[PDB]
Write a protein that binds this ligand. Structure first.
Ligand SMILES: *[C@@H]1O[C@H](CO)[C@@H](O[C@@H]2O[C@H](CO)[C@@H](O[C@H]3O[C@H](CO)[C@@H](O)[C@H](O)[C@@H]3O)[C@H](O)[C@H]2NC(C)=O)[C@H](O)[C@H]1NC(C)=O
Ligand SMILES: *[C@@H]1O[C@H](CO)[C@@H](O[C@@H]2O[C@H](CO)[C@@H](O[C@H]3O[C@H](CO)[C@@H](O)[C@H](O)[C@@H]3O)[C@H](O)[C@H]2NC(C)=O)[C@H](O)[C@H]1NC(C)=O
Ligand SMILES: *[C@@H]1O[C@H](CO)[C@@H](O)[C@H](O)[C@H]1NC(C)=O
Ligand SMILES: *[C@@H]1O[C@H](CO)[C@@H](O)[C@H](O)[C@H]1NC(C)=O
Lengths: 49, 35, 35
């Protein structure tokens, strides 16, 4: 549910759409997530490793 | 390229604002058959 | 007024959407020479 459970009741969102909202938050347009989603996920999975 | 993309129409507000101007243009020809 | 401004074209997406409508308009006249 991303930030929504902090401000009210938890509202579900797909996790890749949560990451798109984040990307807009850092000033990178949300298409840069969806055009690279498998890489962004592989980078995150490697970083957690 | 995008995972989970869906098919839907995207409307263009410039299009009927062009197309009702085609119907204006076309009525000028259809009448100007006559003089 | 602006220090370091540079000369380049700015494209207008409304312009070929008007101009291909000029080529539609113009073909109506070029054919309507004939009837
Ligand atoms: C979203 O809309 C797409 C565009 O209409 C649509 O693409 C079309 O999908 C079908 C099935 O894959 C294709 O049909 C052809 O399939 C094979 C070749 O792959 C041929 O042997 C068949 O005879 C037939 O012609 C269409 O060609 C294809 N259209 C385009 C422009 O590529 C998607 O399937 C839609 N997806 C969803 C989930 O709604
Ligand atoms: C950016 O583009 C500008 C527009 O094309 C261009 O302006 C033009 O600059 C020249 C040189 O200053 C002028 O040429 C005239 O110069 C004197 C008058 O100042 C006359 O005696 C000459 O015979 C000649 O006509 C142009 O008149 C001027 N155009 C306009 C519309 O003002 C800039 O120079 C370009 N700058 C860069 C760095 O690319
Ligand atoms: C047809 O053309 C005449 C001018 O010749 C104009 O007065 C009239 O309003 C036109 N009618 C239509 C239906 O366009
Ligand atoms: C010319 O005008 C006729 C109607 O009189 C139309 O059927 C035909 O499609 C037109 N052809 C072209 C090339 O515009």
């Amino acid at each position: 549910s991303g930030w929504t459970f902090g401000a009210g009741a938890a509202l579900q969102i797909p996790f890749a759409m949560q990451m798109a909202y984040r990307f807009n938050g850092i000033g990178v347009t949300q298409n840069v997530l969806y055009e690279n989603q498998k890489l962004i996920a592989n980078q995150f999975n490697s970083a957690i490793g | 390229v995008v995972i989970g993309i869906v098919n839907n129409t995207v409307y263009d507000p410039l299009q009927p604002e062009l197309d009702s101007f085609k119907e204006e243009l076309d009525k000028y020809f259809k009448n100007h058959t006559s003089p």
